[PDB]
Amino acid sequence: ESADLRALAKHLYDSYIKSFPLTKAKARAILTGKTTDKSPFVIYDMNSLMMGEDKIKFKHITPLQEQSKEVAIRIFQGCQFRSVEAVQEITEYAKSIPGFVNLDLNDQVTLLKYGVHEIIYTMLASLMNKDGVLISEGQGFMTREFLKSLRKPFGDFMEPKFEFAVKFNALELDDSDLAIFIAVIILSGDRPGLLNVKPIEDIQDNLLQALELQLKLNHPESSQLFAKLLQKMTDLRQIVTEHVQLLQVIKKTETDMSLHPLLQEIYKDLY
Amino acid sequence: ESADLRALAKHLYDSYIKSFPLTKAKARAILTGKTTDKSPFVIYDMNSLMMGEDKIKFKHITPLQEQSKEVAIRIFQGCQFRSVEAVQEITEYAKSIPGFVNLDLNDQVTLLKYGVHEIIYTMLASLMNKDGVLISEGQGFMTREFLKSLRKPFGDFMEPKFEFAVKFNALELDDSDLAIFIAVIILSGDRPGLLNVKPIEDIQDNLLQALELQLKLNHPESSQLFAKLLQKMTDLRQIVTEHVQLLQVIKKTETDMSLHPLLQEIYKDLY
Numbered sequence: 001e002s003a004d005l006r007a008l009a010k011h012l013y014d015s016y017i018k019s020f021p022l023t024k025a026k027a028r029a030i031l032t033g034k035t036t037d038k039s040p041f042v043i044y045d046m047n048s049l050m051m052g053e054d055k056i057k058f059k060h061i062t063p064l065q066e067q068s069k070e071v072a073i074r075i076f077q078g079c080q081f082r083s084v085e086a087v088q089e090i091t092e093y094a095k096s097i098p099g100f101v102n103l104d105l106n107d108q109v110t111l112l113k114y115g116v117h118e119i120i121y122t123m124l125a126s127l128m129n130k131d132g133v134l135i136s137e138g139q140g141f142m143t144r145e146f147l148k149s150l151r152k153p154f155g156d157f158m159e160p161k162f163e164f165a166v167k168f169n170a171l172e173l174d175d176s177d178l179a180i181f182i183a184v185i186i187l188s189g190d191r192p193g194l195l196n197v198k199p200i201e202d203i204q205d206n207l208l209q210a211l212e213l214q215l216k217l218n219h220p221e222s223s224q225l226f227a228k229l230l231q232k233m234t235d236l237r238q239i240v241t242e243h244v245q246l247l248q249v250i251k252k253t254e255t256d257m258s259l260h261p262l263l264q265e266i267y268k269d270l271y
Numbered sequence: 272e273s274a275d276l277r278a279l280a281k282h283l284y285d286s287y288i289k290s291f292p293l294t295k296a297k298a299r300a301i302l303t304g305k306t307t308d309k310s311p312f313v314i315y316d317m318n319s320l321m322m323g324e325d326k327i328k329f330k331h332i333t334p335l336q337e338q339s340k341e342v343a344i345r346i347f348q349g350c351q352f353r354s355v356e357a358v359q360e361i362t363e364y365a366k367s368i369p370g371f372v373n374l375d376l377n378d379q380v381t382l383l384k385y386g387v388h389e390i391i392y393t394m395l396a397s398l399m400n401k402d403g404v405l406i407s408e409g410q411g412f413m414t415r416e417f418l419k420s421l422r423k424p425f426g427d428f429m430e431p432k433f434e435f436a437v438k439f440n441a442l443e444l445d446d447s448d449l450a451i452f453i454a455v456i457i458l459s460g461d462r463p464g465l466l467n468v469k470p471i472e473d474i475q476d477n478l479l480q481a482l483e484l485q486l487k488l489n490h491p492e493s494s495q496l497f498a499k500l501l502q503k504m505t506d507l508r509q510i511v512t513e514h515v516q517l518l519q520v521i522k523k524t525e526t527d528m529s530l531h532p533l534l535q536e537i538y539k540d541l542y
């Protein structure tokens with residue numbers, strides 16, 4: 001019944017809020033210039049990037065590190081660090097998706113391994129507009145133009161995420177829609193190396209029913225939004241494979257070797 | 272708060288099972304023969320060492336690297352290669368401790384640097400009884416008396432870890448307990464050169480509260496187990512400092528031993 005699907009949607013939204021403190025709603029308030037109280041520092045070129053450091057450094061140092069390396073490479077390592085934090089946020093969220101924690105632990109690991117990239121881009125869209133991306137928990141904003149301006153291959157590496165975000169954001173999903181959609185992504189029975197596919201597909205079936213009902217209720221005037229959203233997954237996956245290939249080229253063709261070892265530890269048979 | 276601390280303990284246990292192939296439960300089942308698989312080959316002397324290597328017949332070459340010298344040094348090399356693998360597993364586990372990957376990246380590095388060997392020795396006890404230690408994923412058993420007998424400095428590497436294990440194991444901790452204990456060890460605010468101490472202390476505080484409650488629920492009859500377990504941290508630290516001194520001794524008494532690069536990095540300017 002329908003009430004239990006709403007109950008599931010509400011439980012997911014509650015957990016999603018807990019796992020991911022910078023929500024889309026809060027992110028969109030910051031991106032407009034609404035509630036004008038503490039405007040984020042804008043990084044729009046190399047100079048402001050460096051001045052941006054002594055604005056999350058003048059106080060103290062809690063990030064990926066600071067100025068003693070080429071800037072394109074430091075921006076890329078910053079992204080890596082944040083991706084590693086996001087994987088843990090997603091893992092925590094997964095534990096609240098009904099059925100997930102009762103799965104074979106090996107299948108949990110596999111689902112997370114192949115799901116996090118798709119989730120990272122989905123959730124990155126919430127923090128983006130057409131012109132840039134919120135960073136450091138909404139304290140900073142980095143422009144798309146500056147990310148795009150970074151030397152090959154780093155400039156063309158960033159821009160696909162913005163192209164996707166603009167398309168994806170035009171569906172106008174809110175945090176309640178996204179909580180269920182991320183859960184659907186995670187419980188994909190088609191990931192390579194899964195031992196027990198049937199319970200995963202049974203859980204995803206319940207999540208798909210919950211997502212369909214939420215979109216029908218929340219977006220009544222958006223015809224076939226559910227199918228349009230499922231079709232977005234096809235683009236997400238194509239996009240992640242392109243990202244994974246570009247990561248290899250970068251890994252191969254660059255000087256700096258000091259990665260975050262969640263990347264190297266993951267990525268087994270990721271095409 | 273109670274629910275939160277039980278949730279934490281469960282997360283750590285799941286991550287532990289994910290990161291560590293040969294757990295204590297599994298190890299004790301092989302050691303005592305409560306297992307439905309295989310009985311380990313026993314290495315007690317030169318002649319049985321030789322056959323243990325040559326047990327490469329219907330079970331293939333074990334993952335450890337290749338060798339070409341006297342018995343003491345061959346054993347040392349096997350310890351080394353396992354310790355590098357152990358470091359990799361511990362690092363994977365560390366990333367899952369809530370809050371760890373959100374710390375300053377230099378402090379992540381420092382906590383892993385000062386922390387991994389204390390963890391290695393804690394977890395090694397799981398594979399040890401008074402008579403010996405399980406090796407090669409539990410496919411072999413190397414006797415304490417054999418390891419103790421190795422020519423001068425090499426025997427002094429070995430016997431103190433067994434002395435530690437007999438008493439540690441007398442605490443009767445299980446994997447679920449150990450999962451929280453090793454996270455307490457890693458989140459130590461006293462490591463030399465930490466930049467931002469308090470955010471590590473705050474995490475450790477919460478892990479301590481979760482361990483305390485774990486030991487109450489799981490070992491209600493074991494008086495002051497929490498304290499007695501915390502006091503073992505003093506013994507771990509002494510093992511490490513004496514090990515570091517023995518490594519300086521072999522730099523003077525042997526020819527090119529030279530550690531694996533990862534271990535060289537860890538020991539560089541260690542305490």
Ligand SMILES: CCCc1cc(C(=O)c2ccc(-c3ccccc3)cc2)ccc1OCCCOc1ccc2c(ccn2CC(=O)O)c1
Nearest residue numbers: 049074075076078079080082083117120133135136158161
């Ligand atoms: C999830 C991070 C996204 C993301 C995060 C961020 C900073 O926080 C970020 C914050 C600060 C600095 C920064 C660096 C140097 C000096 C001052 C500041 C750099 C970056 C900025 C932009 C961005 O996104 C722009 C394009 C998205 O790019 C991705 C997405 C995933 C990625 C990679 C690189 C590795 N991975 C991991 C992987 O998926 O395998 C790039």
Ligand SMILES: CCCc1cc(C(=O)c2ccc(-c3ccccc3)cc2)ccc1OCCCOc1ccc2c(ccn2CC(=O)O)c1
Nearest residue numbers: 324345346349350351353354391404406407428429432534
């Ligand atoms: C953590 C691995 C320890 C550990 C691993 C192991 C085999 O796998 C192991 C497996 C196979 C052979 C083996 C070698 C030659 C022929 C046939 C077999 C030898 C050893 C056996 C016992 C043991 O430990 C018994 C006492 C523990 O003592 C330690 C612990 C870490 C150490 C040192 C010496 C150097 N390191 C490296 C470092 O400092 O990082 C001693």
